[PDB]
Structures are given as C-alpha cells and as structure tokens.
Ligand binder design. Sequence first.
Ligand code: SF4
Ligand code: SF4
Ligand code: SF4
Ligand code: SF4
Ligand code: SF4
Ligand code: FES
Lengths: 226, 198, 587, 180
Amino acid sequence: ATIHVDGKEYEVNGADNLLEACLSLGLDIPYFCWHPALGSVGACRQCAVKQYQNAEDTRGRLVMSCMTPASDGTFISIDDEEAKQFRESVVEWLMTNHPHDCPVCEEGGNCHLQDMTVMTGHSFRRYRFTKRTHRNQDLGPFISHEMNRCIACYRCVRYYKDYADGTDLGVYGAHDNVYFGRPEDGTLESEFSGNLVEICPTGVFTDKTHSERYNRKWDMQFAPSI
Amino acid sequence: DYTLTREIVTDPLNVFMGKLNDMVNWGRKNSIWPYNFGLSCCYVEMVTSFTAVHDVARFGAEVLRASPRQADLMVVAGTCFTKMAPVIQRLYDQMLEPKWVISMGACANSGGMYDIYSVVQGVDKFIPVDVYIPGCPPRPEAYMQALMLLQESIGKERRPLSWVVGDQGVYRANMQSERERKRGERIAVTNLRTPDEI
Amino acid sequence: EPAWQTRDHLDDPVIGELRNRFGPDAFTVQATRTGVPVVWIKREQLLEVGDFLKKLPKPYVMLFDLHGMDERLRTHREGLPAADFSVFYHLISIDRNRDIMLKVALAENDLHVPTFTKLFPNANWYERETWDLFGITFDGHPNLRRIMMPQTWKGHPLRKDYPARATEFSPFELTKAKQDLEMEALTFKPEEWGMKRGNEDFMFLNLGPNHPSAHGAFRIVLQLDGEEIVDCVPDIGYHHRGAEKMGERQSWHSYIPYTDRIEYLGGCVNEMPYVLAVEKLAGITVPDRVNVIRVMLSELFRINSHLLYISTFIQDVGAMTPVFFAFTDRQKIYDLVEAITGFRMHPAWFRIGGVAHDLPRGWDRLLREFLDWMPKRLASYEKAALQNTILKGRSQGVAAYGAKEALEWGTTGAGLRATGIDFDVRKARPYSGYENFDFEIPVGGGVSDCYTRVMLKVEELRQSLRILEQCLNNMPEGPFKADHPLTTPPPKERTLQHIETLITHFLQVSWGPVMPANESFQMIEATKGINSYYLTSDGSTMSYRTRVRTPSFAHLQQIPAAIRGSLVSDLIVYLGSIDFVMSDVDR
Amino acid sequence: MTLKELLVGFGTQVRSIWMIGLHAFAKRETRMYPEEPVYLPPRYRGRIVLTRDPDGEERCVACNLCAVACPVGCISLQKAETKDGRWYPEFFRINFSRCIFCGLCEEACPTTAIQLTPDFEMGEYKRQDLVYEKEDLLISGPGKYPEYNFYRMAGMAIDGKDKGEAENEAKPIDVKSLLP
Ligand code: SF4
Ligand code: SF4
Ligand code: SF4
Ligand code: SF4
Ligand code: SF4
Ligand code: FES
C-alpha cells in the first residue's frame, strides 16, 4: 500500500491501521487506548490525524489513525495545525482531573501519560475548577491501586478480560466517574495480572514489590536476562 | 587522639619542652606563607582573598612566596589535570618540612564536576591533604576559614624541635570534624529570607 | 519567518558562485538551523574550493573554525553524504558580513584530509586538535602532534567509543611521567617540536609549567639567540577538562555549569551562546525582558573581566597597587551578581528559554550604586597607571601586527578591532536584542600593540557601562521565561500547582528536554574575543556534538608569529596583553 | 632619551606618588573577617539543607529528581514509606567534596525540600566527613520557602489528609451513588 504522510511517500501494509503503520515508520503519533497486543477501539481519541480525499485536497477531516486502515493511496497529515491542537486538547482534557502526584507516583519517569503530555506540547493549565477523586482498593500483595491517576483509556479491562480471560476486574460507573478495578477489595485472581503495571499508561496499577524499595527507571541497572 | 607519620598514638606532651613546643606551634600558625601556584578558577578566588577588600594580610599570610622552598603551605586551588599532576607532585616535593596542604574547591577536593578522562579525581590521590574547602569556587572568606582551620590543626600538632635529640616522627591530632561540631547550631536553623528580595 | 527556522541559504551569492564554478554536481547543500550555508564538498576539491573562496570579489578571508565530528552514531543524516567521520571548516567573510561551513565526509579506514595550512595558518593548531581528539590525519602538515593530551596517549578522546569517565589513578604512571618531566630537559630535541638548527648558538629555554598569574599555568619553549626569540612553540593542553566530551555526556539543561567554566572570567557571557544555540534548536523566541536581563548580566561580567585584565596587565608591567582597588570594584560587581543570581563567578543562571529566577527586589538600587561607583575609580586607575610613562614604554611597540596578520590567524576581540577592522558580533550579527541598545564599538588605527589593546578594552569598559545604564533605565516588565513547551525548567509556581507543568518539569529535569534533530550555531562577542557554540542534536536529550570555538586558542596560536625576533620581557608583556585564560585555550 | 620625555616621566612618577599618598589618606574598604560577618543575599548558593513543612514533617518525598538533575551526581537517596502512606527518604547523603553549589537540585525540587542556604563556612579536615547524611542536612524549619506543602497539592492520601481533602479536589463520588 502507498500512503503520503505530510508530503512524504511511504510503503506500508494495507492490512494494518494508520497508527501502527506510522509507528512502524518511526513517525510519532500520540496514543493511549491502542495496544499492539490488544487492537484498536478508538477510546482515548488521541491518535487524530488529518485525512485528505486526494493529493489536491486542502480541507480534510480529523480521523483516528488507529481506526483508519492504511490502504493504498492514503493521504494523511500528522503535523497539521488542527490535528496538533486537537491532540493537545485531548491531553488537556486528561489533565483536568489528574492529581498533582508525579513525585509520589511510582510511574514517574516511566509514564506513558507524561510522555504524551510532553509530546503534545501541553504545559499550560487554564482549568481552574476541581478535580475528581476516587478511593483506592486493595488488589493483593503484587498490584497497588491508585484510581485518581486513571485517564479512562480502557486498556486494563481490555487486556484483563478480552486478552487474559480474567473475571475479577471491570469498569463501573458512567460519565467522568468511571472506575476501574475489582467489585470489592481482594487479590487479583488472574495469573497474568502483573502485566497491568505496563498495560496501564498511568500510575494506577503499579508494582507493589517494586514500590517497597522504589527507585526510578533512570536509576536502574538493567540486564537482558531469562 | 593523634596519628603518627614517620597508627594512632596518644598525646606525649617536663613543662619547659611543652612551652617550647607551644611557642613553636604558635610561631608556625601565626606565620604561614602560601605558595603562588595557580591552576584554575579557585586560584582567581585565592588572589581575590589576597586583595584589599578581603586582606588575608591580617593573618600574616600575604608574603606569598614564588619559590616552594620558601613556602610553608601549598594551596592546591584548581583542577588536578593529568599533565599538571606531575608538576604538582614535583612542586610539593620541592617543599621543606613542615609543609601543609589546603585543597580549595571541588576539583582539588574530589575532581568536582570533571569526572573526565584528563582529570585526576582529587589531589589527595597522590599528595596528602590537611584542609578541604567545598565550593566551586569557594568565596575568599571560606579560604580564610580554612586558614584558621589549618591554624587550629597546626597549634596542637607535635614536631621535633631539632634533629639532634627527641623523637623525629610527626604527630597530627585526630581533630573533631566541623560537621559534628556545627551540627548543634546548623539543625536549629528554622527560617531564612525568601529569595525574592535583595 | 522566525530566525531559528531551518534554511538552506540557496539565495546566498556564494552558492550560485560555487554552482557556476565547480558545477551543480560537485557539492551538496545541507539545510540547517546554523544560520550559515552548509556545503558538503568532496575531499579532492577542498583546496580548490578554499582557494576559490579566498579569491572571490568580496572573499572569505578568515578561517573561523576547523574541527571534526564522529558521525558513526548519528541516526538522522537525511540528505547528507555517507560519512563515518566529517571535518568542518567554518570560514568568515568580513566584507560580505557572511560565513560558510564546508564539510568533508570521510570513511572509517580512509581518515585523511589534505591540510588547510597553505590557505589559513590557524589550521595548524586546529588540525592538531582534530588529529588529537578524532585521529584524523592531515596530509602535508608540518608537525601533526597531540596538542591537548600528552604525546604518550592511547586513543582519541572525542571519538564515540572512547570512555568519557575518569580512569583509575595509579602512582606508577604518575612516577613515569615525573621521571619523563625531569628527563625532558636533557633529552630535548627540536625536531619533534618543529624547530630547526638548534648552529651551536641558540639556547632552548622552557618557561615553566606553573606561572604565577591569573592567566593560568602553561609552558612555552624558546629558541634564543642571546636574548632574542628566534622561534617558539607554545606547549598547551595542561588545562584540558574535556568540556566537549562532557557536552556529549550531559543533558541540555545540565551542561550550563560546564558552559560557565569554559572561560571562568566570563560567566553569563559564556552562558549566552550556548542557551541561544539551544533555543535555536528548540524553536524558542525569548521575550524582551529575558533579552535585557541577559544583556545586563553579560555586560556586568564583561566589565568584571576587563577590570581584571587591566589590573593584571598593570601588575605584570610592575605597578602592583591598582589591582587591589580593581578587585574592590569587582567585589561591588560580585555583590550585584550575588544578589541577582546567587553566585559570584559561575552563576549558572541562564536557562533554555529564560533565566533561573526573576530579578530580586532591589537590583536597581545596587546597579545604580555600582554605576555611581565605577567612573571615578576608572579615571583614578587610568591617571595613576595607564598614563604613566614606564608602563607606556613597556607596552607600546611590543608584538604589533596589522590587519592581514589578524585576519589570517583568526584574531578576534580587541586585537582585530585594534587593527582597524570594525567587526563586532553585537553589531554585525545582532543577538539577544543588542540592536535596541545605543553603544559604540571602539577601534584602532591599524596596528594592534599592547597599549592599543589595553586602551581598547578601557573604551569597551566605558561602552559596557553605557549599556548597563540603558539596562537600568529601560528594563521591560514581563516574563523571565519563554511561553514555549521546551522552556527548561518551566516556571516554578505552575510546577508547584499544575499537573501538566509538573509533568514537563519532571521529564525535563530527569531525562532532559528533547531537542529535535538539527544543527544550530551561535556566535557572540565574548569578553576576550569571539566565542561560538556549534551544537549537533540527534533528536535525544543530550548533545550529539558540542563544539566550542574560543578566541584564546587563536591568540596563543598567533603568539609565535608576532613575537618572533623580540625579547623575553616583550614576550611576557605580550602574554599580559592578550586577555586569555588557559581554560579558554584548552577547554 | 630626550629632556622633554625625562621631565614628563618625572611628572608622571610624582603624580603617581601623590595619588598613592591620597589613596593612603582614604577610607578602608576591608571587611573584618571573621570578626565582621559576611553579608550574603537571600538566594546565595551555599550550604545545602533539607527543610520541613509548616506542620513540622520533612518536606522531602524521596522523588529522586534532585539526584538526577545533579550534573556531578553527588546526591544519593532511597525512598521509604510510613504506614499511613507518606513517602520520605530512608537516607539522604550528599558528597560535599563533589558538589559545585550550582543549585540545580533546588531548582528541580517539586516540594522545595532541598535548599541552598547563605552559608559558606564548610571547611573540613578529612574528606570522609564531607559526605553529609540526613542527620546533618535536615533542619528544624521551612527555610527560604515558609508555606509550601507538597502533600496539600498531591492527590495521594497520607495521615491527616484523606481523598478529596487536597486543594482543588472534589470529594470522591462512589459509583454506587443514587445520583445520575
Ligand atoms: S500516572 Fe503519570 S502523570 Fe499521573 S501522577 Fe503518575 S507519573 Fe504523573
Ligand atoms: S486504570 Fe490505567 S489502563 Fe485502566 S483505563 Fe485507567 S489509565 Fe487505562
Ligand atoms: S572547583 Fe569549580 S571554580 Fe574551582 S577550579 Fe574547579 S571548576 Fe573552577
Ligand atoms: S548544587 Fe548542583 S552540584 Fe551541588 S548537589 Fe545541587 S545539583 Fe549537585
Ligand atoms: S527533588 Fe526534593 S522531594 Fe525530590 S528527592 Fe530531591 S529533595 Fe526530595
Ligand atoms: S489510540 Fe486511537 S483513539 Fe486511542
């Protein structure tokens, strides 16, 4: 397939969507709800790019790159001004309820939400009202729960239920009061519940064993082991 | 408590020999002659201390000899570069007993910010050091405070009065650190001026 | 169009001239944010291109810079030739008020370039440093030796595979180097140093590693006929701190304290071109209050450095009194700088997009007191020392040169303008809002003597006092930091209460700010000459290459060409009249 | 030399004699250290301390931003936690033989705990005693920032501050609430 991103021609796979095709080419599009192992559901509305009907088109429309296929002869723009403003607006809406928690959060320096906040160029807050609060649950000795940091990207429920076939983690409530977790306090019953600490782009589900003796990612000595 | 250089050995100090050692120590602290050695920024603050606004001369340390044989104190004020370290060692070996060392600034203390291929990580790697000043650079009054610290360390050290009699080893007192000495008044600090004013 | 935008400079006349001369297929134009045309030239056409530029109607007459780049790890080289290494030649045309950067691509195995010393004599030390730090061999060089490291050094430290950290200290190599130092005089031969006919009449005298003055500690070996210096080669590298390797080793924000200590009498002056180049890389246009604050700090530090230079020159001639009062004036300057930035000599106060804090309440009172203090002390020092006959006799007519010698050796600052060339960076290529200040550029008659350079620095002192008066009287009200997302750090109160600003601060102080992959350049008029930063970014949070061009390197290279045939005392007053520091030379 | 040059030289030397004598008849500009204490501005970058909140607890939350913002790498700390959930440093050590007193750690603190204070008198006899630990840095008050409390800003629950008790935070609404 042939796509044109910002006037540059690329050869992609027509069976992929535009987000995974453009991320495979090294282009940077912010995203939250899409995962390579989970698929595209179009929740966070963050991966917006401007699609044009043909080469001689100037108007276009904002579409989700994760929901739009990477078909042949597809003209899109990532660095368009309207798309950039919309992505910064999505980060701004996610920043309205987010707690002032980065120093005391175990995802600091390892946070996908921090990365996409910086990448969108959003560093000014014109929101002056209150932020919603949630009480935490006890998820057992491995996963620490902090629901204030959630951005409702639905990755945890999608992985835990649709991928890992777990039953004890879900989504409750409606509007901006959506809550993610167990119906009551107790240990997460899945054998693959620890992948939530990397599935969650925020610091909601965190490693409690690492949180006991915590240090940031830049302070680690890593090795490739088995 | 003292330590020996020819181990930890107690204080040996007849009263006339004690008064003679006291007056030798007094004359040695009240007349300390630094060596005019320049390495880097910290030497600029050293010669700042020698000038009129600060007036090191009140301590009797303005004589500032240009030959190491005539100097009592070596102030390593700057970075110990790899090429300059043999020069520093030769200059220190040209000195005569007694000779003390004041390390000025982070570079001469530990290498400072310059953990780099061409810098020796501290002047204490190859020559013994008596006083250390943190700073980059230390202000001239910090160098003055180190001069008084060296005076205190000098005034209760034991050296032979002559080579014809007595013990010929040197005794340097294990001084109480300034950190644990000043911890009583440093922790009691409660409020400081806000940085928005002059 | 903003001044930091990526441009290829194809409308510049030199590109069309090169196209009409060598053909369109002979070179490649690279679009950067350096502000100069960057042309990739083939290696076998380098001498022809350089001579063609030297023979232009308004020719490129000065080699500003010459160094290398290790391009093995550069992941973003789109539109660039295939190169394991590269060598860049920055040439400046004063008549055109223009400059051009030529780049020669090199493979790993074939790491040799033709020498540039036949066109520009400062290529000697520049290519010596390029060979020392990158291992690039220049064919036809008279003496290609290591200039920063000792001759018994294994490896080239600016290569990407060299370890930046300090190696473990061992007393064995220290003792070996001490034995070599003691045996250096008896085992001396002039053939390695580049001298000849050591005749049975000339003596060879070393000026000692340690030197008792604020200029630093370095060695110069002299070939003498009686008391006349017939040849000399300066031995430098004793003050090498690996600052460029630290630029590759530190983030964009954390390298500012290392920018401070490049020339330690400059402070904010050395801070200025680095933060301007990073703001070019970031696409940051700083507001006017930031510009006026930076200009005020730069002029305060310029006055400090010039006061030190004049006082040290007066002391080196033989009058030791006025350096004390000059240091009292420097203490007044230090009082103001302490109040504003919190430190005396290395403030580390300029930020990417602004300054670390706002101006404290009471800065204007201290500035007014200092501005009332300065002129009477300046007149007192001038009448007490600078108009006295003995210092004039010791300084006038010593190590003079014309405009051609300054141009061919890359001499900048007070010497170049003493030769009658009115080239100041603050006027020719304005930066930091220097076009909104009413000040003059003092010049000379055509001969750059010691006394002429000293009086030019005195007139620069007076002009900087005028600029400081303009900064005091017209200080704009507004932000002390830019409104850009890449302002590092973000303003502190919004960091302390807004989550997105806390996120930006968290990711900028920890990993570092991400500068998109480009090349930027900034040239400023420093306290001792013309100081430039050349920054290559590969898209990461650290600099891929940090090249620092310092004027003191060029002046110490010009030293043997101007002192040849003079006396030893003439050499020491020439050393006192250059306004250099060894940290500026060796970096 | 010529007679005019000699007379001009003698005049300049006599003028220098008179000006140095008039400098002698002037007023001293020497600060009487240590008898006269050095005035330092409030933002002077001297000795580093760790400060407390107005409530009396230490302000540091062991977030390791100052350690990574240090260009020398002379800050070492480890995060411990109380039973109520409050982060704090288990230890905090600074190698003051390495520190360049540049204030990037104070610039990087999101709680304004680490602070460079106007104090320079820090000379030491042994280099091992230039490694200040938490017992040598933590002071009894807030220092240069007298009112800022990070945990009032944060949404994490600690002792004496539950969910919805932070500033600009609403009370938590349960998903089981009857309101639409
Ligand atoms: S989840 Fe991310 S943005 Fe939220 S407090 Fe933690 S590090 Fe900060
Ligand atoms: S808890 Fe994490 S993974 Fe789940 S929706 Fe919220 S931000 Fe996404
Ligand atoms: S400690 Fe700082 S001021 Fe002193 S020599 Fe080193 S870089 Fe210069
Ligand atoms: S002042 Fe600078 S060198 Fe010292 S601990 Fe803080 S960041 Fe590190
Ligand atoms: S930046 Fe402040 S809160 Fe964070 S670890 Fe350092 S002193 Fe503690
Ligand atoms: S990644 Fe496409 S909407 Fe979430």
